[PDB]
Design a protein around this ligand. Structure first.
Ligand SMILES: *[C@@H]1O[C@H](CO)[C@@H](O)[C@H](O)[C@H]1NC(C)=O
Ligand SMILES: *[C@@H]1O[C@H](CO)[C@@H](O)[C@H](O)[C@H]1NC(C)=O
Ligand SMILES: *[C@@H]1O[C@H](CO)[C@@H](O)[C@H](O)[C@H]1NC(C)=O
Ligand SMILES: [Zn+2]
Lengths: 561, 120, 162, 107
């Protein structure tokens, strides 16, 4: 009869076909990832083409139901997610060109040579030469390719009523049709700018500390060298830890010796993670997780990708891919991946198109909060990896906080600068002959880092990054960083914790578990603003909990500087 | 709509043979039984036999044993009845019917055919 | 009573064409995951469904199976037995021999069996016997693999009505 | 073979008169009986199964009752469209057996 019932019937059929097709595709992908052979690649490609063809046909069929006469919100959301044609909006020649260019970018695009070279070597000349060579070799080739790729994505975006490709990227945060929880796309720009303005003082103090240490190692009022952050680009500042520790005679908490003495393995680590998640009121892992996952390297006979990933194959199939060694870093990455898995199992009851996080920054926030809880000294003391006679003092707290601030606070200026530069390149506010004429300015004004060698417009510097050459967004890291500390503050307050937020744990508490599960079970059906307010009480990202967490280090840095 | 279509009239000389067809539309014959019934001129109705196309098992009225054979092809959705050794007393109209209360179900309806006239 | 051929049959029927057969060790067999008796000739009705659907075989339930495939009356006076059959009804690559009905114009009356394959109509244009826009084939096939979760694995269900 | 008996063979009834037909079996059949009506030149149609259950669409004036070895069919308000031959069938044990038939006519 009415359009709504027909749309409901169409969605009912679509879900039941898509479940099986997606399961087959994911099974083929898993079979490839754990065993690299030609036949596995063949099966992967056939499954991928089948899934893509089915989705294209279903989108073409779905575009016949108008969104104007739908009142039910969930049906509207599913139809909106299904009617987006995407790359098919362009001509066949343009689509073939774009796909060929994507493959070209992937193949032209460091590991493990240069990364280790600038991660360990302390010679200025080697770092400078490697930096200059890497930015002069691959970028110059990809500058016109990046320009034409931007043009093609630009035409694709205006073919879908988006003002720019950046608008299409920001569209993941847009909420419409709900009174009081609406979120425009430029509000993300606005509140990101406001939050970075609030963040700036702590970054200024920490950068002053780090540059003072480097001056003691290598201008008093100039900008930090670009090739001394420890990696190719400056994404993380962990590589400087030994060169920037406050108290150089205080050993850190590395429990690897204890794990080796107690003869641990992957199974013990994952059972510890399962115990931690069960303690807070969440379900334990399924039998398929233990029967089908790959938690150890399959020897040397067969090759596999050792990057740790969490798989939700569908039909109640959840797995973890890991090449586990007996270290503390693996002990925390296990918690991260199992938190990802728990989030995946949380919203399995939602329809197929609504089985996802609220936005791109929720999954990794949920992953991060668990590692935060499990990295505290009290948690390690409880499970027996730390001696009961351990003494906690100011120096150890400052050391741990400086580790955290190097790995967290320093990345935010780089992430925000990269996102803003991409967004205003897509906007068209930066003429071509002046492109880098903006870039290295924002590297100075925002990030506070000066380039070591001047470069003209012939370069394509930021295409040297993995995500830039692989067509990925970048603000998800900023959203993750804010959301994880907001969630941690909310759960710790709900768990009746006394003292600074940097020592809090959520173990053995069911109130925090219920608070987190109320949001996890929602999925993408419910707008992310209302889901956020359910847990923290606010409807937008905030920076106060992060500063509350980092206040002791802020005070120490204010004293030191 | 569910329909059962039968073959046309057949003239059979004594001692000869003929195969009758009952084509089913609207459902799959694998899910139910199919019955065969015969009515002689100015006489009553007599049950011949039945077949389950799912596995091919058949039941017969023993006075028709050796005279009629029932076969079903699930791919073509057709049921067959083969008659051999016909005499002048086999002139009648043959029916293929689909009762559903013979599987002991509830809220069911019967479907019959149009009948094939066989003269000997 | 011939309970062995009822419970140990090699092939089970689909839920849309559920099979009906006319008729202490069963209770103590301990090989059944679900054994629920309501109210306390015998009819044994056998079919195969998903695990998450086993909750729908009960008086006063709603869903796809309860309304379109198999309905139990409010004053039910029998027992329901259900057990997992992943080791028999699942195979590598998928087992697609089991079907179920997804669309129907009205809810099924108790103990009703619909096997019609007429194309369901959702809009106003007649289907004319061919699948297309707003016209769907009613029966859809399950997909069973040995790696699926407990709720997505096949379950054999036998209902005894006295 | 379960021999099946029907009575009467033929009767006349006016419009609106009630008519009962008897259907008796040689042994217990557990109330597995069905009723058929055949109009002149047409194929038979099932009216009642399980001896008291009506097929959907059948007029409510039709009724059936009986248990054990005695079963019956009753029509309340006989109309023009009720003339024909009536049969009753058993399907409890193989082979299935029909009745001899009852012919109904209108004065
Ligand atoms: C939308 O439809 C679903 C079922 O299709 C129903 O459960 C829900 O209540 C509906 N929403 C509204 C607001 O009516
Ligand atoms: C949680 O409670 C149990 C039982 O009291 C205890 O053994 C365990 O150490 C507690 N967890 C933490 C992190 O203290
Ligand atoms: C089915 O077979 C198993 C093993 O052969 C047997 O233990 C069981 O009793 C059988 N089922 C019934 C209802 O007897
Ligand atoms: Zn992650």
């Amino acid at each position: 009869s009415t359009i709504e019932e027909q749309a409901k019937t169409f969605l009912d059929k679509f879900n039941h076909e898509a479940e099986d097709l997606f399961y087959q595709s994911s099974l083929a992908s898993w079979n490839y990832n754990t065993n690299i052979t030609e036949e596995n690649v063949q099966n992967m490609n056939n499954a991928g083409d089948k899934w893509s063809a089915f989705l294209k046909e279903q989108s073409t069929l779905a575009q016949m139901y108008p969104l104007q006469e739908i009142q039910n919100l969930t049906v509207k959301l599913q139809l909106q997610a299904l009617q987006q044609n995407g790359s098919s909006v362009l001509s066949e020649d343009k689509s073939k060109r774009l796909n060929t260019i994507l493959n070209t970018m992937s193949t032209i695009y460091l590991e493990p040579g240069l990364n280790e070279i600038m991660a360990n070597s302390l010679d200025y000349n080697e770092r400078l030469w490697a930096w200059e060579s890497w930015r002069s070799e691959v970028g110059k080739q990809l500058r016109p390719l990046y320009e034409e790729y931007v043009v093609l994505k630009n035409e694709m975006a205006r073919a879908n009523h988006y003002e720019d490709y950046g608008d299409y990227w920001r569209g993941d945060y847009e909420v419409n049709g709900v009174d009081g929880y609406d979120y425009s796309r430029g509000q993300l720009i606005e509140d990101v700018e406001h939050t970075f303005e609030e963040i700036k003082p702590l970054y200024e103090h920490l950068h002053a500390y780090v540059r003072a240490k480097l001056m003691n190692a290598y201008s008093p009022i100039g900008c930090l060298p670009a090739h001394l952050l420890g990696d190719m680009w400056g994404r993380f500042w962990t590589n400087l830890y030994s060169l920037t520790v406050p108290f150089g005679q205080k050993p850190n908490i590395d429990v690897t010796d204890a794990m080796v003495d107690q003869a641990w393995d992957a199974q013990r680590i994952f059972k510890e993670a399962e115990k931690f998640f069960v303690s807070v009121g969440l379900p334990n892992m399924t039998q398929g997780f233990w029967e089908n996952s790959m938690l150890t390297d399959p020897g040397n006979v067969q090759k596999a990708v050792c990057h740790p990933t969490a798989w939700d194959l569908g039909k109640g199939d959840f797995r973890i891919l890991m090449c586990t060694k007996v270290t503390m870093d693996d002990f925390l990455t296990a918690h991260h991946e199992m938190g990802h898995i728990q989030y995946d199992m949380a919203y399995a009851a939602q329809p197929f198109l609504l089985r996802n996080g609220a936005n791109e920054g929720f999954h990794e926030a949920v992953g991060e909060i668990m590692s935060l809880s499990a990295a505290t000294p009290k948690h390690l003391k409880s499970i027996g990896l730390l001696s009961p006679d351990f003494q906690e003092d100011n120096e150890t707290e400052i050391n741990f906080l400086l580790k955290q601030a190097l790995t967290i606070v320093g990345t935010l200026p780089f992430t925000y600068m990269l996102e803003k530069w991409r967004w205003m390149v897509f906007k068209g506010e930066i003429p071509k002959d002046q492109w880098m004429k903006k870039w290295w300015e924002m590297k100075r004004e925002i990030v506070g880092v000066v380039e070591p060698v001047p470069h003209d417009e012939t370069y394509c510097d930021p295409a040297s990054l993995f995500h830039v050459s692989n067509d990925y967004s970048f603000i998800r890291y900023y959203t993750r960083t804010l959301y994880q500390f907001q969630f941690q503050e909310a759960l710790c307050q709900a768990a009746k914790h006394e003292g600074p937020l940097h020592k809090c744990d959520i173990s053995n508490s069911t109130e925090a578990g219920q608070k987190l599960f109320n949001m996890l079970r929602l999925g993408k059906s419910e707008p992310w603003t209302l889901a956020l307010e359910n847990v923290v009480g606010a409807k937008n990202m905030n920076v106060r909990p992060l500063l509350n967490y980092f206040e002791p280090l802020f005070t120490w840095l204010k004293d030191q500087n | 709509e569910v329909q059962l279509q039968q073959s046309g009239a057949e003239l059979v000389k004594p001692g000869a043979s003929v195969k009758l067809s009952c084509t089913a539309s609207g459902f799959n014959i694998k899910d139910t039984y199919m019955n065969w019934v015969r009515q002689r001129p100015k006489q009553g109705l007599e049950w011949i036999g039945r077949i389950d196309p799912a596995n091919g098992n058949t039941k017969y009225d023993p006075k028709f044993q050796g005279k009629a054979t029932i076969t079903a092809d699930t791919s073509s959705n057709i049921a067959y009845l083969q008659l051999s050794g016909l005499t002048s007393e086999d002139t009648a109209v043959y029916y293929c019917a689909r009762f559903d209360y013979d599987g002991y179900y509830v809220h069911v309806m019967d479907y019959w055919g149009q009948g094939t006239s066989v003269t000997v | 009573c011939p309970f062995g051929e009822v419970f140990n049959a090699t092939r089970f029927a689909s839920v849309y064409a559920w099979n009906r057969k006319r008729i202490s060790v069963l209770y103590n067999s301990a090989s059944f995951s679900t054994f629920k008796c309501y109210g306390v000739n015998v009819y044994a009705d056998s079919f195969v469904i998903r695990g998450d659907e086993v909750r729908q075989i009960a008086p006063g339930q709603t869903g796809k199976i309860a309304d379109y495939n198999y309905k139990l009356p409010d004053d039910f006076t029998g027992c329901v037995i259900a057990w997992n059959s992943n080791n028999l009804d699942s195979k590598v690559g998928g087992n697609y021999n089991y079907l179920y009905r997804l669309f129907r114009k009205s809810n099924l009356k108790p103990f009703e069996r619909d096997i019609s394959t007429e194309i369901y109509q959702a809009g106003s244009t007649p289907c004319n016997g061919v699948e297309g826009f707003n016209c769907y084939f009613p029966l859809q096939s399950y997909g069973f693999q040995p790696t699926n979760g407990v709720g997505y694995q096949p379950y054999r269900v036998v209902v005894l009505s006295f | 073979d379960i021999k099946m008996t029907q009575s009467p063979s033929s009767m006349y009834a006016s419009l609106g008169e009630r008519v009962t037909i008897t259907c008796k079996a040689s042994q217990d059949i557990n109330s597995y009986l069905s009723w058929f009506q055949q109009k002149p030149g047409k194929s038979p149609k099932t009216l009642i199964y399980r001896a008291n259950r009506l097929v959907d669409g059948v007029p409510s004036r039709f009724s059936g009752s009986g248990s054990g070895q005695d079963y019956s069919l009753t029509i309340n308000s006989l109309e023009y469209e009720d003339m024909g031959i009536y049969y009753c069938l058993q399907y409890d044990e193989f082979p299935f057996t029909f009745g001899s038939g009852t012919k109904l006519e209108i004065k």
